[PDB]
Design a protein around this nucleic acid. Structure first.
Ligand code: NA
Ligand code: NA
Ligand code: NA
Ligand code: NI
Ligand code: NI
Ligand code: NI
Ligand code: NI
Ligand code: NI
Ligand code: NI
Ligand code: NI
Ligand code: NI
Ligand code: NI
Ligand code: NI
Ligand code: NI
Ligand code: NI
Lengths: 140, 140, 140, 140
DNA sequence: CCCTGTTAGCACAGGCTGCCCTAATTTTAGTGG
DNA sequence: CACTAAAATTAGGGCAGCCTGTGCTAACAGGGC
């Protein structure tokens, strides 16, 4: 198992965080946040272009395709739903929830996601306050 | 990401499965169970033997080492606690919870397992009846 | 510096050697001979195919392009002239010449090569009996 | 292969050159002579500093460590024993021997160096008049 | 415009291990003669 | 021991995903001519 559990999904989520924070998505940002060498993130981002999940712009900005944005959103959704489960229900300490959720985001089915929306009483936010994306696309 | 999520863990737990059922743990069993080829299974098993996780015994059986066994128990434990959590709290359909728990077992920290035991009122079994191993060494 | 000094050239000359011994040139033979990993050679071989030096047949034979074989021949010429110089003139023990010539083949210019045909009295074989190829196309 | 063949050795030997010439060894000086960019030589210098090959003094003068000096001496010695060999034995036109010995210095074993000392009747200088350093260390 | 160097963000070459495959054998455990 | 069925190996790959080394341009900074 990868330390990232799913590399591709971690690249998508990271680009998405960047968009949330209002910083320009560059390969250099992904290498910083995931502690990887430039040649590593360059090659991996190429594989993701090949598979149509992102594209490198002329100015080197990373952009999510439609397939890549739909997936990124899905992962962010599971992440924050996992965060809620972990805090509201399990009571895992705060400073551990993101780290745990960062693994959970790559394995939770949408089947489970929909159950969690019901069980956690229709949560629109993570336990930190960040809005949960893609609830419509989940189907809620 | 790996279909198995964690190949090493799925190999250890699969060996746990065969021991629990009373069938001789052979590489040929892992090939059937995990649907992989013989060459693949021997190759991975070699890595795991190299890494101190198991031995290929003189008569070909796969004996888990002490490190291998602790991990195998830790993974089976997370699996059945995940199964309990999914049925009792999340309400995932029976048909599906094993498939789900087969992924969660690979990402759940012991920190969450300990908090699950309480959340689930000191469970001793999976919803399918099988006993939950390693509750002692989990520290409860 | 590379341990091979020149990876591409060593690959070419290795292919040359294999052909010369009458063994089918496969990536596996190169992996053995240069002690490199399988993915390393397949990747290097890919660059060489990108660059017009060879192609991988459908049955996985490595086929030198006309340009590829010209470079291959050119390197062995340098190798074997270097062996003549090192034995006939410099007097390096017989056991250590191939090792030295193996690094030399990669830095020798054609100008030097041509001066060595003169100085060594139109040589036509290695000290070990093997013919020096590429003399005609050298400028002889 | 690298155009310099061995970047580290060419950096060491270049520093050594400047010291013979009595010019202050600065990174700008290296950039100049090997025709590379400021950034490149700045990065390459720090790897070497890292590996204990040189010190960058408070005033920015590059300074060889005893380990860096020993390697620079050995490359200069190879460079000049090669020059000798190229003029006296091989007969390569004058205008071309420095370019040829600029590559050979990086591949010649000490085993060959000691044979060249014997065969060229104990040379002390290059055909350009510059003294060959490290003949003592070589083991003569 | 030099000069000397830095910081940021790339490029390509050439290395690695993990974990997956087919085809074609070979070894081994158990069975029957 | 001799055939067989199950088990494992041998041979030669595949792709994903890590790495360091060694090169680049742009922008900038501080001082100089
Ligand atoms: Na790194
Ligand atoms: Na290797
Ligand atoms: Na340049
Ligand atoms: Ni943009
Ligand atoms: Ni988070
Ligand atoms: Ni994650
Ligand atoms: Ni046994
Ligand atoms: Ni189960
Ligand atoms: Ni699993
Ligand atoms: Ni063929
Ligand atoms: Ni040879
Ligand atoms: Ni060579
Ligand atoms: Ni100084
Ligand atoms: Ni010179
Ligand atoms: Ni040089």
């Amino acid at each position: 198992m990868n330390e990232l559990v799913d590399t591709t999904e971690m690249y998508l989520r990271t680009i998405y965080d960047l968009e949330e924070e209002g910083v320009t998505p560059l390969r250099a940002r992904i290498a910083e946040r995931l502690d990887q060498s430039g040649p590593t993130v360059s090659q991996t981002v190429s594989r993701m272009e090949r598979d149509g999940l992102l594209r490198v712009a002329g100015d080197r900005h990373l952009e999510l395709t439609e397939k890549g944005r739909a997936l990124a959103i899905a992962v962010m959704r599971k992440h924050r739903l996992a965060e809620r489960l972990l805090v509201d229900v399990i009571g895992l300490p705060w400073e551990e929830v993101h780290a745990e959720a960062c693994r959970w985001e790559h394995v939770m089915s949408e089947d489970v996601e929909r159950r969690l929306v019901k069980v956690l009483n229709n949560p629109t936010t993570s336990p930190f306050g960040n809005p949960i994306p893609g609830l419509v696309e989940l189907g809620v």
